[PDB]
Design an enzyme around this catalytic site. Structure first.
Site, PDB file in Angstrom:
ATOM      1  N   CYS A  37       0.911  -1.174  -0.116  1.00 29.91           N
ATOM      2  CA  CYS A  37      -0.104  -0.096  -0.054  1.00 29.91           C
ATOM      3  C   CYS A  37       0.780   1.269  -0.041  1.00 29.91           C
ATOM      4  CB  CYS A  37      -0.988   0.079   1.219  1.00 29.91           C
ATOM      5  SG  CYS A  37      -2.022   1.466   1.625  1.00 29.91           S
ATOM      6  N   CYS A  40       0.054   3.918   2.657  1.00 28.02           N
ATOM      7  CA  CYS A  40       0.353   3.351   4.065  1.00 28.02           C
ATOM      8  C   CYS A  40       1.831   3.449   4.413  1.00 28.02           C
ATOM      9  CB  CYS A  40      -0.155   1.674   4.169  1.00 28.02           C
ATOM     10  SG  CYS A  40      -1.997   1.477   3.657  1.00 28.02           S
TER      11      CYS A  40
END
Length: 112
Positions: A37, A40
């Site tokens: 991600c 993230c």
């Protein structure tokens, strides 16, 4: 016994609730992410620094993978990263996406 504050602790479907229940009146922050991600990974370094500055807040992270599916759904996830803020065993706030500023405000609010 060891102190959980000052760092980010990874949790899973079996260890998340017990930790929340033992938080006391300390606000609990949960970073719901997945592997690979982009947003993230960008938030990760910043999240760890937050844990170092706010010693009265418990910082956790949950990998929203196949194994933890049931808990991610129970918490309500749509996109990662999502940050849940809990207090007294209750979700009292949420920040969706890598919104650092909104995350800070959500934390300050939970404290005072």
């Amino acid at each position: 016994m060891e102190a959980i504050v000052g760092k980010v602790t990874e949790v899973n479907k079996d260890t998340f609730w017990p930790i929340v229940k033992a938080a006391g009146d300390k606000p609990v922050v949960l970073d719901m992410f997945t592997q690979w991600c982009g947003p993230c990974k960008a938030m990760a370094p910043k999240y760890e620094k937050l844990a170092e500055e706010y010693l009265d807040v418990i910082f956790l992270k949950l990998d929203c993978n196949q194994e933890n599916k049931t808990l991610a759904k129970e918490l309500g996830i749509r996109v990662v990263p999502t940050f849940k803020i809990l207090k007294e065993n209750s979700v009292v706030g949420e920040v969706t996406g890598a919104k650092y500023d909104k995350l800070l405000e959500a934390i300050q609010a939970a404290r005072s």
